Structures are given as structure tokens and as C-alpha cells.
Amino acid sequence: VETGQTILTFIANMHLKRSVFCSELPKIRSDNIKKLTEPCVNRNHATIIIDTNYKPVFD
Amino acid sequence: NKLFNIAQRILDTNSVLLTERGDHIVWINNSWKFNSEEPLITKLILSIRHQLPKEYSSELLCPRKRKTVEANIRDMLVDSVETDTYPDKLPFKNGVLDLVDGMFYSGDDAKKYTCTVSTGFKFDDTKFVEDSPEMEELMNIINDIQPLTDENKKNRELYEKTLSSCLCGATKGCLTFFFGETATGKSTTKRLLKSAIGDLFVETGQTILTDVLDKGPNPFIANMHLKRSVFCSELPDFACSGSKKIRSDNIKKLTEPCVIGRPCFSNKINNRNHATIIIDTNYKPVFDRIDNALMRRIAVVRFRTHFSQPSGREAAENNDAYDKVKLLDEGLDGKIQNNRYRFAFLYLLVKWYKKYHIPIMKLYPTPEEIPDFAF
Amino acid sequence: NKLFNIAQRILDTNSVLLTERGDHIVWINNSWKFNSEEPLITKLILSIRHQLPKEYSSELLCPRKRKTVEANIRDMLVDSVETDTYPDKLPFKNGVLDLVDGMFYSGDDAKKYTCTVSTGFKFDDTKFVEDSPEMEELMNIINDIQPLTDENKKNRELYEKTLSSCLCGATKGCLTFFFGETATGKSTTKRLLKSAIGDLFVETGQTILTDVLDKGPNPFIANMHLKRSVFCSELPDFACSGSKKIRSDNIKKLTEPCVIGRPCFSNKINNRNHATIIIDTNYKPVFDRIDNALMRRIAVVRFRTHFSQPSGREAAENNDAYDKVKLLDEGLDGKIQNNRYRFAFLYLLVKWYKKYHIPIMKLYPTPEEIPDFAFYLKIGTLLVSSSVKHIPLMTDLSKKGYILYDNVVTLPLTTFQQKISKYFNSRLFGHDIESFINRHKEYLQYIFIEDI
DNA sequence: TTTTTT
Ligand SMILES: Nc1ncnc2c1ncn2[C@@H]1O[C@H](COP(=O)(O)OP(=O)(O)NP(=O)(O)O)[C@@H](O)[C@H]1O
Ligand SMILES: Nc1ncnc2c1ncn2[C@@H]1O[C@H](COP(=O)(O)OP(=O)(O)NP(=O)(O)O)[C@@H](O)[C@H]1O
């Protein structure tokens, strides 16, 4: 699954997928980061892989 | 048992098929059709009654038994066959026209290409020639909107390539902007396109570019399924106070082969993107995020001819945004509305397709036309 | 079998059709009717039972067997048809009135023009005459609201043209503003028009102007499908604070032949625009952005006759917003509501349509009425744009402050500011001048007319 | 269930 600047900054399009891709990180909303770790938010089965162009800055 | 054999015989003719989305497509009157709010399977059961044997035909006249046959058919349909896999076929209400050669297929020949959408009108091979005065009148209309001058050569070619892309059913990698001032012929071009392709043409609202799509039913997105041309007219002056500056993420989704959106009282959320998306603009677009991905997704076609009235002619000739000034035809919107140029603009589109989009179809961006992309 | 034969003879008469929007239109009582929540097909089956032989008519008295016939009918209707394609036909509840002629058609003659809308009242030829002693009173009313004088000559003609175009089932390219002070006759004109065309007249809200048209269910715009006259009322002085301006985005959208907007619990997002859109005003409208594409779609009709009570008459004869003052008629409002002038006004509209909108129907704008367009109108006659006709004249252009830059034509910002300060002050157009400078910003390719 | 509501 591909998704941009929505999950970091689609609940149905995250269920049972083994991988979720986010691109061009345009903060990163660390509260959202903590949410994707838990198995239940639907069930999380995805190695959420992010590709970046520049060094990211957290909140 | 007898109604089970009727359903099996109907299924043996491959006139009902199931799509991965969940549609039931029927083959009535030389055209594949699907509709979630119309008894299309029963319409086929009634029409197919002439091909079944004599004793099986009388049983199909009672409506109640036709729903029994329909239930049997819907239970038989477990598999799912891919549809609309031919990007160089033009579906009409009575056949399919090949865009590489000039051959038109009607009947079982057109059935091989599972074209579930259609133009909505029949193919009449009497005006699809080149001759007849409709073509001569139309060629004057087009040559005034986009003159054949050398400075317009690249613009005229981009104009031809974008319009001929509406014939090809496939995913298009660019979003074209029709830029011009008032009375430039953009809406005339759109209305000519609509009569040429008919039901393969849909107009959508502004929320497909400025508003987040994922919320509730979205008929403005669900109606673009398999359409080959989407027009979003009247781009507002976002470069002002109190406005929404399009959206750079929507363009990424609108270029993807799959678009998410569901109709009312329906669960089908996947739509296939086959449309050349053109936006009618008096102002060139601006975006919240200018990325590198956005660079190869936008093309601009500029209209620089003013169709003025005899009263306001002198002022028009002293305008920078106009290269030619012509005379407005009051009785021209009526001719387009009555579909007079339906099969002449269609021939022009077919010729442009044969010249440009075979054997490879692709649209290229023109980022050196937007002030924002200059930096 | 027997109920299948009945359904086939019903389709042989072509009394039920399927439209491109999925609606089943039926031909009952000399009119094409459609309704998404009414049993119109079974209504036709019961009504049409008299044209069937004896053995078939008796089986149509059972509601259960009329549903079987209806179910058979919907299965045989596979192809759509085009509807409402004749713009010069006025459909009534019992026929269609030709506008190019005075002919009225009722029967199979009116069936050819598949007009799915109608006024909703039966046409009366005994009142559609001319003499009609109510017509004298109607002439008295109309000649007061829009007097027949030399000063109110082009305004009276525009008034007649706008009201006549409400009979045409085609797309109108202009939006008309009924502008006047209080008690000038705008609502009387609206109520007279509503009485004459009936259900072809619809009253809509203010959202269709000042908000987006496609943000989910918007019944205020989906009710204008196939309507020939749309009225908006009382824009709340948009030039003042706490107001949302006209949003010229919708003005161009409302002119297009198709307007995007959907009703509740439906996916029909395309509506056909056949409407003359008229807005009653006490103040001139103000738009968010002024464009040449906006000045091409605006017309204004002025109302300048005051109908006052005897007490406050003298306070109205000294007002510059009124040209004439007349006694208010207290019983006039109730007479219009009773459709007393229903057919006299219709005869007037048909006569004016024959005078103005034949053979080509088109509404023209009046940019010289809106005060917001004055700046653009002045600039249109103040400047010449770029080049080509002026390169050989640059020898005489060395003086008068003209310089050379980028080898076409140039003018410094200070020079243009000083020059434009000499034609009109910045007291009212300072923001307008700044907006023009910003939009056309440094150098400015523009040449004065007097320097040519 | 969509709209209504958030
Ligand atoms: N080749 C032509 N010859 C004569 N009249 C034409 C021609 N092309 C267009 N017109 C007319 O010119 C008018 C303006 O065309 P239109 O399609 O509205 O352009 P437009 O740019 O979309 N208008 P706008 O929305 O203000 O930008 C219409 O009445 C057309 O019928
Ligand atoms: N020709 C006429 N002779 C006498 N009275 C008339 C005439 N025309 C209209 N009236 C009456 O004059 C009154 C005021 O007219 P009205 O239709 O309310 O204009 P108006 O512009 O809508 N008022 P306002 O909403 O404040 O702008 C009403 O009671 C009408 O019935």
C-alpha cells in the first residue's frame, strides 16, 4: 500500500497488509508513530517503510 | 430443474460475467452493460429467450420465474474475469471500433473485447469519412481556436495529442490544463469533445482536486470509473484571500491506476482510472506543495484567440492575451448541442490518434508553462 | 403469457420510456410525467386499459396483476431516449404550446416533443386571447413598474427580454440582477412570473452563489434541473462587513449547460441548466474577483417606481432613487396569488418572445451598470497593450517618459503610478490600482492611447 | 444507511 502525507501527518486500507509505504516526507507526529506500533488501533501486520529525501526532524 | 437448465444454457453463451469489483455485466444489443440499480440480468433473460429452444421460451414470459433464473445465474457466477484490457478500442452502442486500423466490429466480433462502457450512441458509417460539408465547417472551427501558425505549432500539437488521448482507454500520466481568457474556445472544445465520445465523458466537481476524498459516499469520484475523459471546469482564483490551493496529493492519487471512492448505497470502492483529466482555467494553477513528482504530472495548453462581437472588437485587438480576433457565431452552440459535428470531430480524433498515439501512448508534461515551477 | 401480451401492446404505444438518467417517464393525461417515489407505470397501466380489447382490460383491475405487467415493462425497456431537446416548446399539463407560432398541441402532436417538465396547470385558450379585460389591468401594472418613457427605454427592453427568456428551454448565458430600492415592484414581477409559468418556476437559496456547489447533498442546486426560471432574493449588502461576497466562481458555473450537484440519497451529479437566473436586490452586488469572464455574464434591470402609502408619499418624492411615486394598491398582492393574471401575462410573454428571441435566443450583458466593473471598463479604454504597431513610433516616444527595457515596451513603476494618479484618484481606486499593479507586475508593458 | 454530524 502507498500513502503520502496522510498517516504520518486509510484505516480500512491498512488491514492485513504485510507492508505499507509512505513517501517524500514533506513535523512527523510522534504520537502517530506510537500508534502504528500497537497491533490494534483493524490489525497491524505491515512493515511500514518510509523513504526520505532529507534528514527528518521529529517533534 | 427446468429453470436450472435455462440458467445453465444462458451461462453457456457467456452473456453474463462477474467483475473483480463485483459488477454483473450483461451482453444486450451488442454492448456490455452494468448497472447496480437496474434489473439488467432479467433484461438479458427476456431478450435471450429467442435463442433457447421452443419449450424453454414460454417459461421465461412469467416475471417470477425470471427472478428464479437470475438467482440461479448469480449462484453459478463464482469466477471473475478481467474487463477493459484493450486500450485501443472505442466502444459504441452497436460495436467496437479499432483505433489502430479503420475496422469496425459489430456482433460477436466486438464481444471479445470486454468493453463494459460505451459512448452511448450508435456508430453511423455515413459521416465517418473525411468528406461532406460538416468536416469543412468543423476544420474552420478548430483552425480558428488553434491556428496552424508556426508559433502555435508546438501548442497545436499538444492540443491534438491531448484530445486524441481521450480515445485511448488507459491510465494517463499527466493532468492537462486548458488555459485562456474569456471567449477563447475552451468550452467550445469541451462541448465538441462531449458530443464526440458521449458517455465516455464525465464532468466532476472541484472537490476531486481541493478536498480529501476519503469521507462517506463520493459520487463525484465513483462516476469517473472507466471514463476516458474527465473535465473539471472553472478553476477559481485561489491566488487571493480565502481559498484552497488545489492539492498536490490528489494529483498523485488521480494519476494512479486506482482511485478510491464509493457511490451511495454501494460498497464498490475501487475505480479504474482511464481518463484524460482536463481542467478549464482562466488562471494557471498553484499548489500547496511543489515537489519533483508534481513536475511530470502537469501540461498546459494555451488558447489565444478571441471570438468577440462587432461592438467590442477594437478593445480586444489591444490585448496582450490575444493573438487573433474573430467573429462570434451565435448559432454555433446550437449546432454542437444538436450533435452536428459528432462524427466529424470523431474522425479528426481518430486521425490524430493514428498519427500520435500508436503504437505507444504517453503524455509528456510541460512544466515550463507555470510561473510556480520556474524556481 | 396473457399478462406478457398486455405489456407488449403498452410498449407498442410508446407510452412509457426510459431516460438517460434512469427515470421512467409515462404519458398520462396528455403529459410526460416522471416521479421517483410514485407508481407511475402502474398508473399508466390502469389508465390505458380502455384502449385494450375486452379480454385484456378486465385483468388490469387487480393491483397484483398490474405489478406483473409493470415488471414485464421494465424488462423490455433496454435503450434510453433523449428528452427536452426542443427549446421553443412550452409544455403545459394538457399539451405543448409552440412559441414560434401561436399553435397549441394536445395529443400525439405534443407527444413528439418529449418534455418531461410542465407548468402544472391546464392551458385555457379562452383566456389566452388578447382583449381579456384583465389584460388592461395587467398593462396598467406593467406600465407602472417599467414606465414606457424615453429614459426607461433600454431598461424596459431588457426587462421584456429577460422575462421572455423564461419560456425558452435552452441554456442562458447571463445572470440578471433586478436592482431597485424598496417598494419598487420586483417581488410583484416575481409573483407575476410564478403565476404564469407555474412549476417551471423555482425559488432557490443563497448558497448557490456564495458557497461551493459540490460538497455532498445540495438540494438547493439539484432542484434547478430542467427548470426554466430560478430566483434568488435579497443578497445581504455584500459590500458591508460580516458578509460573504458573490464568489464569481459560481457565476461562471451557473452559466454552463451542466451544473454539478446531487440530491439526497442519489448519485445523479449532472443537472441540465435551462434557467434564467434572476436575483432581486436592494444593493449592487460585489464579487471576490473581477475578470473579463465575469463581466460577460452579468446584466442589471433597474426598478425606479415607488408604490407608497398616502402618508409617506412626500418623503418619497424627494428621494433620488425613485423616478415616479404612485399609490400602493393593497388588494393587488392577493389578486396575483389567485392567478387572476395567469394567462394575460403568459400572452405578454409569448408576444415579447416572438418580438425578441426569434430565431436566436441569447441574453447580452450590461457591464456599464455594475459599479465594480468601472475600473476594468476604464482601463479597457485607457491602455494599449504591447508592441508591433508601436516599434516604428518609438522615435517620437523618446520624450513623454517612455524608456526601453527588454526590447518590447516598458514603463517604470513610479512612472506608471504618477501617470495613473492623473486620471483618477486613489481615494476609491487605491486598492484597485494596487491590485492591477500587483497582477501586471519591474516593468509594465502598457502604452497610453494619447501617446500613439 | 445516508445524512448529519464532528
Ligand atoms: N471557431 C469559432 N467561430 C465562431 N464562434 C466561435 C468559435 N469557437 C467558439 N465560438 C463562440 O465563441 C463564444 C465563446 O466561446 P467559449 O467556448 O465560451 O470560450 P470560453 O473561453 O470557454 N468562454 P470563458 O468561460 O469566458 O473562457 C461561444 O459563443 C462560442 O460559440
Ligand atoms: N402597479 C402597481 N400599482 C400599485 N401597487 C403596486 C403595483 N405594483 C406593485 N404594487 C404593490 O406595491 C407594494 C410593494 O411592491 P413590492 O413587490 O413589494 O416591491 P419590492 O421591491 O419587492 N419591495 P422590497 O422587497 O422592499 O424591495 C406591494 O404591496 C405590491 O402589491
Ligand SMILES: [Mg+2]
Ligand atoms: Mg467556459
Ligand SMILES: [Mg+2]
Ligand atoms: Mg421583495
